[PDB]
Design a protein around this ligand. Structure first.
Ligand SMILES: CC(C)CCC[C@@H](C)[C@H]1CC[C@H]2[C@@H]3CC=C4C[C@@H](OC(=O)CCC(=O)O)CC[C@]4(C)[C@H]3CC[C@]12C
Ligand SMILES: C[N+]1(C)[C@@H]2C[C@@H](OC(=O)C(O)(c3cccs3)c3cccs3)C[C@H]1[C@@H]1O[C@@H]12
Lengths: 444, 7
């Protein structure tokens, strides 16, 4: 390695090092000192920032130094500790990506039952166990394989992992550790892309119809449970409970769980849409509408039934003609509007605007999606060349050159610099605490 | 889980 080369690489990866340390350390201190940031969401980013911090302060610098000098000078035990720390931290980063992806998936697909158990305790337990499984997966074999085999194979002055002898070995580990997590993450991500609409429908109908896990008597008097699930119009409090037990599958005794309310809601809403597509009057307009207004009409069918909604003849035609304001005014003439005005006005605003403004704002959530997509894409592109190089090195011996190995190994470190720069700068509270910390002027 | 956060 030439002197100019050494100076350039050392300076640049130095800068990248202190940028990683500064960023992730700022996440840690901001979380510690600002209670507004002490959210379960930020538990995960704190753990990620611990991994990226470890990588930023030890890994990039020891690896860049050993690569520039050409030999390892800190000894065998320091070598083993460095590789153990690097692989444990990196596998931890992957594991936290998986944990975030699953957390988001369950938050969208089980918006009621999962959100009820997203407690700081459970978050801390699963973060800690992600780190535990990373450590168990990498540290024992990196440090003690030499004593178990009986001799240390790695040359004096050099530093690498002994048990990754064969390229097929390291490619199997690359599948378990990288490829399968990446595929699971992507399949999730897409699944959330295809489920946000159903969650918005669920939350809309929970706002309008309410949620009770104990049976109550509705407007007309009949017995209902869950999110507006009517059991039976009979007057017998146990004629209701028998149909409840038949609907869930256990002796309900009148009380259900929130995931049973989610199951009951899914059966109800699927029945609503399936019926809509069976009804000759509602199918044309439902087909003509976008997703949000489709949700408004699903709302009306949930409240009044298909015959009752089909009774809105002229307003439904105005909906088919995209005459939103005239349809709003016309639906305001209805007894429906005069009997449940607060819900009817929300539904009407949904028809008029085609947005969720009458029910909820999704700005912060959409930006959180942008942040997560940025993080995972940075991960994929900075980590993919190395694992592709493993994949190739299994089929062919020594195709990929040593320079390429060095660069692809070094590139996996960069997403540790990128991760805090995603949520931190464009997310408020983080930005403001970063500012007041870098100013040394934080007094609560 | 953001969704409910204020702007
Ligand atoms: C292999 C070795 C060298 C690395 C293992 C380090 C772990 C022991 C660390 C890394 C990330 C840490 C976690 C990152 C974030 C949190 C959230 C944190 O929640 C709060 O602080 C909010 C409540 C409060 O402020 O009191 C509690 C600790 C915990 C679980 C940490 C516990 C310790 C963990 C698992
Ligand atoms: C630059 N690294 C520090 C080292 C090489 C790269 O590693 C990879 O991407 C691999 O798929 C593997 C390399 C060799 C076998 S499996 C992972 C290892 C641990 C989790 S995923 C990325 C990170 C990780 O700490 C290793």
């Amino acid at each position: 390695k030439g002197p100019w080369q050494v100076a350039f690489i050392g300076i640049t990866t130095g800068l990248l090092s202190l940028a990683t340390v500064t960023g992730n350390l700022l996440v840690l201190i901001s979380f510690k000192v600002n209670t507004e940031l002490k959210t379960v969401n930020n538990y995960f980013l704190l753990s990620l920032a611990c991994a990226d911090l470890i990588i930023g302060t030890f890994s990039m610098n020891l690896y860049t130094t050993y690569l520039l000098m050409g030999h390892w000078a800190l000894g065998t035990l320091a070598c083993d500790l460095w590789l153990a720390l690097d692989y444990v931290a990196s596998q931890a980063s992957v594991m936290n990506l998986l944990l975030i992806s699953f957390d988001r998936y369950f938050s969208v697909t089980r918006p009621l039952s999962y959100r009820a158990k997203r407690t700081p305790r459970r978050a801390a337990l699963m973060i800690g166990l992600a780190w535990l499984v990373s450590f168990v997966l990498w540290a024992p074999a990196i440090l003690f394989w030499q004593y178990l085999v009986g001799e240390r194979t790695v040359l004096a002055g050099q530093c690498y992992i002994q048990f990754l002898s064969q390229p097929i070995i390291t490619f199997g580990t690359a599948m378990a550790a990288f490829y399968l997590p990446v595929t699971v993450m992507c399949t999730l991500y897409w699944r959330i892309y295809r489920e946000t609409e159903n969650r918005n429908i669920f939350e809309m109908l929970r706002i309008d119809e309410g949620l009770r896990l104990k049976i109550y008597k509705d407007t007309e008097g009949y017995y209902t449970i869950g999110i507006g699930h009517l059991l039976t119009k009979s007057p017998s409090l146990n004629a209701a409970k028998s149909e409840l037990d038949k609907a869930i599958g256990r002796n309900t005794n009148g009380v259900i769980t929130k995931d049973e309310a989610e199951k009951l809601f899914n059966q109800d809403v699927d029945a609503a849409v399936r019926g809509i597509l069976r009804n000759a009057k509602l199918k044309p307009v439902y087909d003509s509408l976008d997703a949000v207004r489709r949700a408004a009409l699903i709302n009306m069918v949930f409240q009044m039934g298909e015959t009752g909604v089909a009774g809105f003849t002229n307003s439904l035609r105005m909906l088919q003609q995209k005459r939103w304001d005239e349809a709003a005014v016309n639906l305001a003439k209805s007894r429906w509007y005069n009997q449940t005005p607060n819900r009817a006005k929300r539904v009407i605003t949904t028809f008029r605007t085609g947005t969720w403004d009458a029910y909820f704002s999704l700005v912060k959530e959409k930006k959180a999606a942008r942040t997560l997509s940025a993080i995972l894409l940075a991960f994929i592109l900075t980590w993919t060349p190395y694992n592709i190089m493993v994949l190739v090195s299994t089929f062919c011996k020594d195709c990929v050159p040593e320079t390429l190995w060095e660069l692809g190994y070094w590139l996996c470190y960069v997403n540790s610099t990128i991760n805090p720069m995603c949520y931190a700068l464009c997310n408020k509270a983080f930005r403001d605490t970063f500012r007041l910390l870098l100013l040394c002027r934080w007094d609560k | 889980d953001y969704k409910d956060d204020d702007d």
